Amino acid sequence: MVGQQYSSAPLRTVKEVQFGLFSPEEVRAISVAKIRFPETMDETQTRAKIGGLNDPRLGSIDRNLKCQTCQEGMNECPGHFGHIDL
Amino acid sequence: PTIRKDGLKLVGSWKKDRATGDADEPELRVLSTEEILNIFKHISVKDFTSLGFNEVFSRPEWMILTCLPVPPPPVRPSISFNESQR
Amino acid sequence: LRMKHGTYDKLDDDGLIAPGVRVSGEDVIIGKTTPISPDEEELGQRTAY
Amino acid sequence: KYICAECSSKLSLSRTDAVRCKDCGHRILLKARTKRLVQFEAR
Amino acid sequence: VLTCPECKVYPPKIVERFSEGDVVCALCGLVLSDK
């Protein structure tokens, strides 16, 4: 009874932990926001700059707004990964 | 060549054969990361197994970074004293 | 906004409690207010007034 | 109301007045105890 | 916005219990958000 919500995915238990390494293809596919700017929050100083370090597509920690990617509160959003190209 | 490590750089020295007529002076050069990546990308599956790597999870070409994943803000939470104090 | 559950009644008009008052758990003895710029909003928590 | 720290002079200060004594000019001011005694119960 | 789903009163009356990590409606005593 954890999460204070209902989901239809079955409960299971971890049996193995197979380590490994990312391919750049995997880093690209997993990511949802290609970070591009060295700034976090907009010039209005009220919202985070889109494409910055604090892009709303990654998630939020605050308890008022919900994540743009999954539309869930901060107590249910795990967090999503960005990527940077070298 | 013979390879040594200086800080974060990997410097090689070519000891030319004495039969070539040149002096036994190993020419020094800083090895370029893209060349090493190209060399590693050319290795085969039997050498993959022999060295001690894996085809699916643990290729050696992946040991050199090209894209850097960015962790979500849960991993790096911002502490907000006030409305404009982050 | 974001007032504390403590009893503000013991505070004087100056915002400072006066000597000789039996304070107790979670009461307040100093009243401090912070002005906030209009462009700063607590993600919808703040109201007009 | 307030009270001075050296001569303990009786002063009244507003919300904008400078925090100083009129006679000695010191910068240390003390309050005055609640004139109306208030009964309490210790719980 | 956080409202009680049983009192249905606007604007909602809400008290936060910090020492218990809870948000509680001040009328029905219902617990809204924890931790």
From Swiss-Prot, chain B:
The tandem 7 residues repeats in the C-terminal domain (CTD) can be highly phosphorylated. The phosphorylation activates Pol II. Phosphorylation occurs mainly at residues 'Ser-2' and 'Ser-5' of the heptapeptide repeat. The phosphorylated form of Pol II appears to carry, on average, one phosphate per repeat. The phosphorylation state is believed to result from the balanced action of site-specific CTD kinases and phosphatases, and a 'CTD code' that specifies the position of Pol II within the transcription cycle has been proposed. Residues 77-86 are annotated as: Lid loop. It is found in: Nucleus. It comes from the Eukaryota. The C-terminal domain (CTD) serves as a platform for assembly of factors that regulate transcription initiation, elongation, termination and mRNA processing. Component of the RNA polymerase II (Pol II) complex consisting of 12 subunits. Interacts with DEF1; the interaction is direct and serves to bridge RPB1 to the Elongin complex in a DNA-damaged dependent manner. Interacts with the Elongin subunit ELA1. Interacts with the Elongin subunit ELC1. Interacts with ASK10. Interacts with ESS1. Interacts with RTT103. Interacts with SHE2. Belongs to the RNA polymerase beta' chain family. This is DNA-directed RNA polymerase II subunit RPB1. The gene is RPO21. The chain holds residues 172 to 257 of 1733 of the full protein.
UniProtKB/Swiss-Prot annotation, chain C:
The modification Phosphoserine is found at residue 37. Disulfide bonds: none annotated. It comes from the Eukaryota. It is found in: Nucleus. Belongs to the RNA polymerase beta chain family. Component of the RNA polymerase II (Pol II) complex consisting of 12 subunits. This is DNA-directed RNA polymerase II subunit RPB2. It comes from Saccharomyces cerevisiae (strain ATCC 204508 / S288c) (Baker's yeast). The chain holds residues 883 to 931 of 1224 of the full protein.
UniProtKB/Swiss-Prot annotation, chain D:
One of its GO terms (biological process) is RNA-templated transcription. The keyword Transport does not apply. Keywords: DNA-directed RNA polymerase, Metal-binding, Nucleus, Peroxisome, Ribosome biogenesis, Transcription, Zinc, Zinc-finger. It is found in: Nucleus, Nucleolus; Peroxisome. The keyword Nucleus applies. Zn(2+) binds at residues 4, 7, 21, 24. It comes from the Eukaryota. A zinc finger (C4-type) spans 4-24. GO terms for cellular component: cytoplasm; nucleolus; nucleoplasm; nucleus; peroxisome; RNA polymerase I complex; RNA polymerase II, core complex; RNA polymerase III complex. Its main location: nucleus. The N-terminus is blocked. DNA-dependent RNA polymerases catalyze the transcription of DNA into RNA using the four ribonucleoside triphosphates as substrates. Common component of RNA polymerases I, II and III which synthesize ribosomal RNA precursors, mRNA precursors and many functional non-coding RNAs, and a small RNAs, such as 5S rRNA and tRNAs, respectively. RNA polymerases are composed of mobile elements that move relative to each other. In Pol II, the core element with the central large cleft comprises RPB3, RBP10, RPB11, RPB12 and regions of RPB1 and RPB2 forming the active center. Present with 907 molecules/cell in log phase SD medium. Belongs to the archaeal Rpo12/eukaryotic RPC10 RNA polymerase subunit family. This is DNA-directed RNA polymerases I, II, and III subunit RPABC4. It comes from Saccharomyces cerevisiae (strain ATCC 204508 / S288c). The lineage of its organism: Eukaryota, Fungi, Dikarya, Ascomycota, Saccharomycotina. The gene is RPC10.
Curated annotation (Swiss-Prot), chain E:
Zn(2+) binds at residues 4, 7, 25, 28. A zinc finger (TFIIB-type) spans 1-33. It is found in: Nucleus. Present with 6750 molecules/cell in log phase SD medium. Belongs to the TFIIB family. Associates with TFIID-IIA (DA complex) to form TFIID-IIA-IIB (DAB-complex) which is then recognized by polymerase II. General factor that plays a major role in the activation of eukaryotic genes transcribed by RNA polymerase II. This is Transcription initiation factor IIB. It comes from Saccharomyces cerevisiae (strain ATCC 204508 / S288c). The lineage of its organism: Eukaryota, Fungi, Dikarya, Ascomycota, Saccharomycotina.
